[PDB]
């Protein structure tokens, strides 16, 4: 995940080391909305792409899929998957990398977060939930990661897409869905919430 | 330009057929080659397969025993079919028109190239959740908050369907309360949390209970809530 001002170059590398001839092609995903073809065939662009994204050759053998991005803008803020074809490696069925480009030149404001940990009564019922509420940001795009202690947790979280406020920013919430013996046994839990390139972290411990 | 839908008939219970349809319009679905991608919770963005009229179609390696992809010619229409479904299946399915080329790098009579696909045109793609939910109540936990101000609330938990209402101390408190929009989680019941904002000096004096109607399954809850 890197940050650039705009006008500045972003590079994003994609994918493992080319063994074959290649014909990397490159995705743009931004938030909730469909994702776009940037590069095909390592370096050609489809219509409408400008000239500002650029990919990696093919050569020499042992390069890694490189997208270049010259004097970002804001619109150039998402995920950015490469989709490699090589002739030494087996067609590949699931898209590489995921990379997420923030811009920095942004108007904005920071989330406000509030972290509780599994209630009493919940845990009775031998059930455990972390509920994270992120209120107060714009844009309306947040990235929840959760940490068991130091390590990140990918099972059992549930985040909600962001919502219009009243006051026209946004809230969200995650939840982290939890055994009662994971709760006791990690020494905390934290939820990280990245926001326009920084991250709020609110940790509880039971 | 050409646009796609990805659409299902509607909801998937544990070991039924996930059936989807990428409704094509701007153009024939028999000019071009089609595919079906998903995203996961659990895993990354993943290619399912292609299909075209010619017959050229295949399936992903890990999928290819369950998966089904069809042309609708009539109906101008790419058919997704996925047997057995479960809770792993559950994610956003995308339709995306499906281009190919050659990559030539020696002499073609030496098999010294190979066709690459690429995708140009996607769905918004639309999201699939496995679950048997039926109408069921929420229950109703307290979430507990020196100077300052504190955050107490109430989490309503795993009811179904949406949606359910929040109030504080039957209406007297409305002053700093945020209700917050429910997550659809992997189970296919929601869960919302209703928190107010309060003075900490106040956790003394004011009493707080939080309201929950649930009307589909007729639960009315007051669960007081304190430090
Ligand atoms: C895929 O997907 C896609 C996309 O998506 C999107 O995006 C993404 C990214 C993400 O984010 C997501 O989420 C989103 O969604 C899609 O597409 C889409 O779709 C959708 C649907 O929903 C849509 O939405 C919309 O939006 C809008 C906005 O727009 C814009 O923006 C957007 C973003 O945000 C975009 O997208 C678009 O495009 C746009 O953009 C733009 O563009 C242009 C051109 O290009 C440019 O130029 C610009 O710049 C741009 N911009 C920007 C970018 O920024 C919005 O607005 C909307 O909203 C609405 O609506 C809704 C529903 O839908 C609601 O909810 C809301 O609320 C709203 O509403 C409204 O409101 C207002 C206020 O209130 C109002 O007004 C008022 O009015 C009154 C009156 O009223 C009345 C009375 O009277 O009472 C009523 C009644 O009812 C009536 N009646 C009748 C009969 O009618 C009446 C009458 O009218 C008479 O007249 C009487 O009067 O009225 C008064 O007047 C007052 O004063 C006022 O104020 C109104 O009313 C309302 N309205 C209504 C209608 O309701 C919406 O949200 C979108 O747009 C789209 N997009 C596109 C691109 O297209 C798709 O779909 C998918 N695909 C597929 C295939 O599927």
């Known amino acids: 995940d890197i940050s650039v001002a705009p006008g500045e170059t972003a590079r994003i590398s994609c994918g493992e080391k080319?063994?074959?001839?290649?014909?990397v092609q490159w995705y743009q995903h931004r938030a909730g909305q469909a994702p776009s073809l940037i590069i095909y065939?390592?370096?050609?662009?489809?219509s409408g792409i400008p000239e500002r994204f650029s990919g990696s050759p093919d050569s020499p053998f042992g390069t890694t899929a490189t997208l270049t991005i010259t004097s970002v803008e804001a619109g150039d803020e998402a995920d950015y998957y490469c989709?490699?074809?090589?002739?030494?490696?087996?067609?590949?069925?699931?898209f590489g990398g995921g990379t997420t480009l923030t811009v920095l030149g942004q108007p904005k404001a920071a989330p406000s977060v509030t972290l509780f940990p599994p209630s009493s009564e919940e845990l009775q019922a031998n059930k455990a939930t972390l509920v994270c509420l992120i209120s107060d940001f714009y844009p309306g795009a947040v990235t929840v990661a959760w940490k068991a202690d130091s390590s990140p947790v990918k099972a059992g979280v549930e985040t909600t897409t962001p919502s219009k406020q009243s006051n026209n920013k946004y809230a969200a919430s995650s939840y982290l869905s939890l055994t009662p013996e994971q709760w006791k046994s990690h020494r905390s839990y934290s939820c990280q919430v990245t926001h326009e390139g920084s991250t709020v972290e609110k940790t509880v411990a039971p | 330009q050409m646009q796609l839908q990805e659409s299902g008939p509607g909801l998937v219970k544990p070991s039924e057929t996930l059936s989807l349809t990428c409704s094509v319009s701007?153009?024939?679905?028999?000019?071009?080659?089609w595919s079906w991608i998903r995203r996961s919770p659990g895993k990354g963005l993943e290619w399912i397969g292609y299909?075209?009229?010619?017959?050229?179609?295949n399936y992903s390696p890990s999928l290819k025993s369950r998966v089904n992809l069809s042309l609708d010619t009539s109906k101008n229409q790419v058919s997704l079919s996925l047997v057995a479904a479960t809770a792993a299946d559950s994610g956003k399915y995308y339709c995306?028109?499906?281009?190919?080329?050659?990559?030539?790098?020696?002499?073609?009579?030496?098999?010294?190239?190979?066709?690459?696909?690429?995708?140009?045109?996607w769905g918004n793609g639309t999201q699939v959740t496995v679950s048997s939910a039926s109408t069921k109540g929420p229950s109703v936990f307290p979430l507990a908050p020196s100077g300052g101000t504190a955050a107490l609330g109430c989490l309503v938990k795993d009811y179904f369907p949406e949606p359910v209402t929040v109030s504080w101390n039957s209406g007297a408190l409305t002053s700093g309360v945020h209700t917050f929009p429910a997550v659809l989680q992997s189970s296919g019941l929601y869960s919302l949390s209703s928190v107010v904002t309060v003075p900490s000096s106040s956790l003394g004096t004011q009493t707080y209970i939080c309201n929950v109607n649930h009307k589909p399954s007729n639960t009315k809850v007051d669960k007081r809530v304190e430090p």
């Open positions: 995306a028109r499906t281009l190919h080329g050659r990559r030539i790098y020696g002499i073609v009579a030496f098999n010294e190239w190979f066709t690459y696909f690429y995708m140009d045109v």
């Open positions: 701007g153009a024939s679905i028999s000019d071009s080659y």
């Open positions: 299909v075209h009229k010619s017959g050229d179609t």
């Open positions: 080319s063994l074959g001839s290649r014909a």
């Open positions: 065939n390592n370096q050609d662009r489809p």
């Open positions: 989709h490699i074809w090589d002739s030494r490696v087996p067609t590949k069925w699931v």
